[PDB]
């Protein structure tokens, strides 16, 4: 089976270019030509059809800085989906705000717009929709709600680089878009993050937030070898969340084939959708008409335990991995909801305000039915598998079909 990550001599070439420039950080001085960071930023901005792009250290930090740039802090509430990686919620706690969970839709696993209004209070300042696995949150409904209630929208696109909703790439629709480039993502450098926005003011603030209150110099063409490209601004307090040049170089390389590989993943995902949907008891995810291009970080399908011998997703996956010989990293059940995830334990850290970290019972006692049911009756196939030949993917289909015949 295809493995992940993937590299080529082109990747090595980009790394060699960093060594030749002898500039390993954006805070390093100008050595003659543009930094890998800015070259990648320009390329990704074009890819996303978004005015501004600022690379950073991780998707988690990308989310945090997005919140900081919007002026979110103590006393504020931010609405987030219960089903997602814990970072979507911890980024909120990191800025002293309170994450407020809302359940997801049964057929997309993305935040349910019809449950958002009920969670809005006078403290609500933003919503962080997540385009989970291989689906997009309903940005039409979400932006309508955000507009009516004067709320900001931050798109968590860590699992949807390149997805398109009504001809707008994921991340360009909300006020600020955040991406992760951690190893498992479709665009990766091992570690890495990306922030994008259409607003010029936010672009300046984001730069400062990740470069110790600094911004790019007025004109890079006027720079001489030895001159600093980052200059003081001081409009907003920032810290160091600069991506290394080695990572920006790898991202530049990986980006050149992102659209093509996403196209392959989608072709195969659709193939699976039509094949798996014919099996009684299997339900594929519902694709919104507004989505013209879907990036599949993870291919998800659901099953009815009643029609599959009462198996839970863990057992279902174990059976499939044995039959297909693929690793746990590549075929497994979805995350546990954030409020139930052992990795989510805000109350254990004094750094968090007592008013927002609450107590163990406060979070664990929350109830979000749809999100909770997900890890028990859904199967997630990592995108690398979607790069395999159709003949190979057919084996997965046959496996699910066999298992089904075993209970029919």
Ligand X SMILES: Cc1ncc(COP(=O)(O)O)c(CN)c1O
Looking at residues 165 to 204 of the shown chain, list those that interact with a copy of itself (rule: CB under 8 A): 182-184, 188-192
Neighbour tally for 249: CB within 10 Å: 26
Report, in Å, the least distance between residue 305 CB and ligand X.
26
Looking at residues 338 to 397 of the shown chain, list those that interact with a copy of itself (rule: CB under 8 A): 342-354
- 398 binding a copy of itself? (CB under 8 A): no
Report, in Å, the least distance between residue 408 CB and ligand X.
36
Nearest residue to 177 via CA among 190, 160, 191, 189:
160
- 57 binding a copy of itself? (CB under 8 A): yes
Backbone phi, psi, residue 224, to 5°: -105, 160
Paired tokens of 151: 């709320």
Site for a copy of itself (CB under 8 A): which residue of 168, 213, 220, 312? 213
Write out the residues near ligand X by the rule CB under 6 A: 58-60, 63, 84-85, 87-88, 130, 156, 158-159, 180, 182, 193, 240
8 Å CB contact between 174 and 184: no
User: Which residue, 133 or 316, is less far from ligand X as judged by CB?
Assistant: 133
Paired tokens of 141: 């409904």
Task: Find which of ligand X, a copy of itself, none residue 325 binds, CB within 5 to 8 Å per kind.
Answer: none
| Distance, CA of 399 to CA of 171 (rounded, Å) | 36
Report, in Å, the least distance between residue 62 CB and ligand X.
7
Site for a copy of itself (CB under 8 A): which residue of 66, 145, 250, 331? 250
Site for a copy of itself (CB under 8 A): which residue of 50, 95, 102, 196? 95
Region from 47-55, 238-246, 270-278, 371-379 binding a copy of itself, contact rule CB under 8 A? 238-246
Region from 1-9, 285-293, 383-391, 396-404 binding a copy of itself, contact rule CB under 8 A? 1-9
Which residues neighbour 258 within 8 Å (Cβ) at sequence distance 6 or greater? Answer: 47, 161, 162, 186, 187
- Largest separation between any pair of C-alpha atoms in the chain: 74
Neighbour tally for 118: CB within 10 Å: 9
| Distance, CA of 186 to CA of 123 (rounded, Å) | 35
């Amino acid at each position: 089976w295809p493995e992940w990550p993937q590299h080529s001599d082109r990747t090595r070439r980009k790394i060699e270019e960093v060594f030749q420039s002898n500039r390993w950080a954006i805070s390093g001085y100008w050595t003659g030509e543009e930094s890998m960071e800015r070259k990648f930023a320009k390329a990704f901005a074009d890819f996303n059809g978004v005015p501004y792009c600022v690379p950073t250290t991780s998707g988690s930090t990308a989310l945090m800085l997005a919140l900081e740039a919007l002026g979110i802090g103590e006393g504020d509430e931010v609405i987030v989906p219960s089903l997602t990686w814990i970072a979507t919620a911890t980024a909120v706690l990191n800025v002293n705000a309170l994450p407020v969970f809302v359940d997801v839709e049964a057929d997309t696993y993305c935040i349910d717009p019809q449950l958002i209004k009920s969670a809005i209070t006078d403290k609500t300042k933003a919503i962080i929709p997540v385009h989970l696995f291989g689906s997009m949150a309903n940005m039409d409904e979400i932006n309508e709600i955000a507009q009516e209630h004067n709320l900001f929208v931050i798109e968590d696109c860590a699992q949807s680089h390149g997805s398109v909703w009504n001809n707008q790439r994921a991340g360009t629709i909300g006020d600020i878009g955040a991406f992760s480039c951690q190893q498992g993502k479709v665009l990766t450098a091992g570690e890495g993050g990306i922030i994008v926005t259409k607003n010029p003011r936010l672009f300046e603030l984001i730069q400062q937030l990740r470069a110790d209150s600094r911004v790019y110099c007025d004109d890079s063409s006027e720079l001489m070898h030895g001159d600093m490209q980052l200059v003081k601004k001081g409009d907003i307090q920032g810290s160091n969340y600069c991506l290394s040049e080695f990572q920006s170089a790898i991202l530049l390389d990986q980006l050149q084939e992102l659209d093509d590989k996403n196209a392959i993943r989608e072709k195969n995902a659709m193939f699976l959708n039509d094949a798996l949907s014919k099996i009684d008891g299997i339900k594929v995810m519902k694709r919104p008409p507004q989505v013209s291009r879907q990036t599949y970080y993870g291919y998800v399908f659901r099953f009815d335990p009643v029609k599959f011998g009462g198996l839970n997703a863990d057992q279902f996956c174990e059976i499939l991995r044995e039959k297909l010989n693929m690793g746990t990293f590549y075929l497994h059940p979805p995350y546990l909801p954030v409020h139930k995830n052992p990795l989510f334990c805000p109350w254990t850290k004094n750094r968090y305000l007592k008013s927002v970290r609450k107590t163990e019972a406060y979070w664990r006692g929350l109830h979000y039915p749809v999100s909770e049911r997900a890890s028990g009756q859904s199967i997630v196939i990592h995108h690398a598998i979607l790069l395999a030949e159709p003949s190979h993917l057919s084996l997965l289909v046959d496996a699910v079909a066999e298992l089904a015949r075993k209970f029919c």
